[PDB]
Amino acid sequence: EWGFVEDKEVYEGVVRLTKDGQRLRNMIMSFNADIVARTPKKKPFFWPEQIAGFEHMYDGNDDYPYYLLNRTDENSGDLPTQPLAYYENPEVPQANAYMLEAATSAVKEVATLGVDTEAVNGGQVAFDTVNQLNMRADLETYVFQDNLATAMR
Amino acid sequence: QYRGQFDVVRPVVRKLVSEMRQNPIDVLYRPKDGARPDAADVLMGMYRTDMRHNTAKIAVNIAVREQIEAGVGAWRLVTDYEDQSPTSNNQVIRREPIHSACSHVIWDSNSKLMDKSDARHCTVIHSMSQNGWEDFAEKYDLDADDIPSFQNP
Amino acid sequence: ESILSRFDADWTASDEARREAKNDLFFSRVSQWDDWLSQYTTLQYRGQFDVVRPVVRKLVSEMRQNPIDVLYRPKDGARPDAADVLMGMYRTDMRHNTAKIAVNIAVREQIEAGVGAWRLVTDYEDQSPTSNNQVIRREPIHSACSHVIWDSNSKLMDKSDARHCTVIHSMSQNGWEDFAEKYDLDADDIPSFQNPNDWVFPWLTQDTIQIAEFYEVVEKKETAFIYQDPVTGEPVSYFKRDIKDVIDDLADSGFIKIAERQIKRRRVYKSIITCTAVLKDKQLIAGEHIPIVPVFGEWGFVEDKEVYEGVVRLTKDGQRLRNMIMSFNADIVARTPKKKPFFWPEQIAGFEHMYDGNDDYPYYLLNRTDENSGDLPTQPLAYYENPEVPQANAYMLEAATSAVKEVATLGVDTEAVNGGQVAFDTVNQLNMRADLETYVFQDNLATAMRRDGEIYQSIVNDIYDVPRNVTITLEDGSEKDVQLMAEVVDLATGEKQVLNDIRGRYECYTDVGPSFQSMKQQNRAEILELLGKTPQGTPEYQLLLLQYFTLLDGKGVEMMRDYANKQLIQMGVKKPETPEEQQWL
Amino acid sequence: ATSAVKEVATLGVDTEAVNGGQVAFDTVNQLNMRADLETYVFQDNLATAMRRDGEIYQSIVNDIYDVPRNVTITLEDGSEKDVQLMAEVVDLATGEKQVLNDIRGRYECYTDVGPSFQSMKQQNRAEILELLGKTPQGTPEYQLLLLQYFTLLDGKGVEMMRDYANKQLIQMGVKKPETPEEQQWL
Amino acid sequence: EWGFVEDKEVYEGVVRLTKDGQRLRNMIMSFNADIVARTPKKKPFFWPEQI
Amino acid sequence: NDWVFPWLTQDTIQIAEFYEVVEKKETAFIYQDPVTGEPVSYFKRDIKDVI
């Protein structure tokens, strides 16, 4: 089942509809599986002197006190500085909502074929009419070419 | 990185494969009144006295899936005229569809529908099958070094 | 290089692991052990995820639709053997396992994993000769196809090619005493195979000592009726034909040859495949009927071998995120020493015993008295964090809700038909009844003869040669009782082992198809409605008199067989099997 | 996390009525019964016979008859003569054999595997999971029901199938009870 | 009647999902029971000059 | 017994008796020489079909 105008017969098909259309799914893969390399590396930064200590810090030994801090700082005076923001966030979760919904809608479209309550001259479709008989490609029982016959004895 | 999880498009056509239940469409050789019905003595045994237990009814479906997947072809036959101990009329024909091997096959002849005589037989090609190679025993067996050269896909 | 045959052509298969291990072997493992492969730095405390199994099991149990019970199939073409007394073909079949249930443990994994059948001892195992019938069949055991890659496969189940391909079980030890039933073998067959250890040998199992048994391998036998000519003395007189007639008969003219199925023979030299090792010294076992039926499925791929079907890979990386959220959550509670109570403990931790009793109203630790700094307030009521509550992963997986389950997709419909029976019913019924190789007419051991013709009565045939007259039953008689009044004791035609071909030897009728047939199934199975198809009538009830008996094989109810059959009189309905009731005058 | 526990406890989720929930685990049952019988009845070496399969002493009653002269038969009339278990002439061929050995009697009588119900007039009376009253009726369908609701066989008062049927109604003859002797007159 | 892998094998139970299937419910247990003893007296404190 | 574990009970007091382990019984009466050598005149059977 192929339609054509140009000498290369082009298919007519279903699954090729949404191929790149639903790459909208891979945009969750383009964030958490790929550009997640932005990894938080969250540092509370206020008074650990210089950040490089001995290995005890991130191994979590039974010795509790985390104090690294002592301050006599650079000369400016009467002014703060606020690190608060830190690193990054998840990406603006709005505009991505309807894309997947449209793809899935086009998907529930292909689940509608000859839809009936039930029965009432049921669900025969194009593919049945074309696929019904290879028995009629097997139609041959000496139907035109007759050779074999009973011939009692 | 980590890819090959996508898939998930399948189920849309999984509804289209399952209609096979009604694919049989049972009907058996309705006679006419213009021929001789008195010769019908053998007719009542057509599905019986020759081929009775028949697996090939599933072989239709093997073509049914690949159909929506891709084009549907046809393949080799072993003559149904067989065995020993001759018997009565006993004729029905068979064909068992295989899976694909039509991929790079290129046909330009007619390729619409064939009820009647038409083009006889033209082109059959398979790439990297095995099948009846070492089974040459009963056909010709002279040399068979011919083996044309193609650009393999 | 002639004798060696296919193994050198089969080395490209078993050379090394390549891609047919990592990709394929996921077929049967998904239900077991774990998922992740390449991703670096995987962490601990969850060692068995499952999160596959719920997919397959229930739907594997959704294939149970296949009783398909219709039996004792009568032959409609001509007389089947023995008729009324032969009903017992299914005798030993229905009692234990086989097609009724054991197909459960037999088929097992097909769509999820590789499928097939496994070993057997001899063929027909029952000892004692007797009058009854017998049916015995396969009893495979354990899951030996994982690493198996066996190639001769281009086609189908029923193919006429080399039968059952090749037979090897991966490793067998108990079997050491199982094949001990042969004659005094040196017991060391010492095969050398390479099962890749990557030279560090992670697993230590050393099992060896494997054999293979057969005699006729790919026995090639065709019609080939006397095709050759004596003139010119051509070599290679090996016979060939397609259709018997062609040239028709040159016989009555000339060319008398007349040799029938006696050949001093050469056979194909593929032998117990190996380079330098062969034995082939006087062993004979039956012939290859081989009722053992390994089954092999069908799905899409270029050609030759395949990466076969599985449905679970949609979820595998939907699984990974349920495992990775424990990488984003359970770890940070361990990364947090929970609260560090320092706002101006200038003296750090002194007086440790103030942590003894953990009450101590006078906490202190606080004085100021320091260098020049200035007042710089701090508000870590949020501590220092950029907290992200998992809002993204939730919806990322909400589109994957049904797709992370993605199964049990079948059997969805209102009611009745258009239901949950897909090709797998007819494909696994192809795992059941579709084998053409078993059939009936096979003649090997003595199951073959029924009456046998007695192999005697020729010597007694002289009675019809007696002179004077020949007369049928006369002169009454009284004590006769049972039938078979015997003087001539003569039959016709002949009785032998088999019936030849397509006469009398047929096996099983119809195909996959209706569950209703011609024997008295009306009875107790109707789910919704009941009756109204055949209401009352005056002849109707004398029609339904003989119908409704459900007996099959009963005991107390058997007087049915009497009926009115004493005197046929005005009814004379069935004209039945046994003359013994009806023959009195 | 709740969605994990819902998965494992589900076996054959179904609505109601037909299309039941039988699993392979149900078949452990007759794997256990077969784990009994074929470990017992598949070997009978000694005791099947009650006393040595008749003790083979009684054969001595054969003493005078096989002599070629005439043998006494044809009881003159008789009324109460019909009672079971008497021995005078004792016309019988050979005798029963113990264990298994040569001829038939070795291995017999096992269950018919299938749905829940059985038949000793049972899946006749099954009904249950599919509606009710599936029995059709007709005018002489009550001669099928001259058996009526009789069900449990050997019971004391369901025994009506025998005594009530034992004499006067024998003009019918559809019955076949277990009763030993009868005959005699009216 | 179960599946198989090799030889005879570690037994597959329905409890293989239930091992950690309870998961982190227990984490809400972490904040309450005995760990108030770890916390030294939630201190309501201000302007307490009593020296 | 993992020798570090405090658990008390050690002694057992009970046993069992083997019977058949790889013990082969054979009948195998047929098919060997009547008179001349009688070497290995008794051995197991393969096919039951016919001589």
Author numbering:
A (entry chain I): 306 to 458
B (entry chain I): 52 to 204
C (entry chain H): 9 to 593
D (entry chain G): 408 to 593
E (entry chain G): 306 to 356
F (entry chain G): 205 to 255
Paper text:
Procapsids are built by multiple copies of coat and scaffolding protein polymerized into an icosahedral shell that incorporates one dodecameric portal protein at a special 5-fold vertex. Portal protein forms a channel for bidirectional passage of viral DNA, which can move in and out of the virus head and provides an attachment point for the tail apparatus in tailed bacteriophages. Packaging of viral genomes inside procapsids is powered by an ATP-dependent motor that assembles at the portal vertex. In P22, this motor consists of a large (L-) and small (S-) terminase subunit assembled in an oligomeric complex.
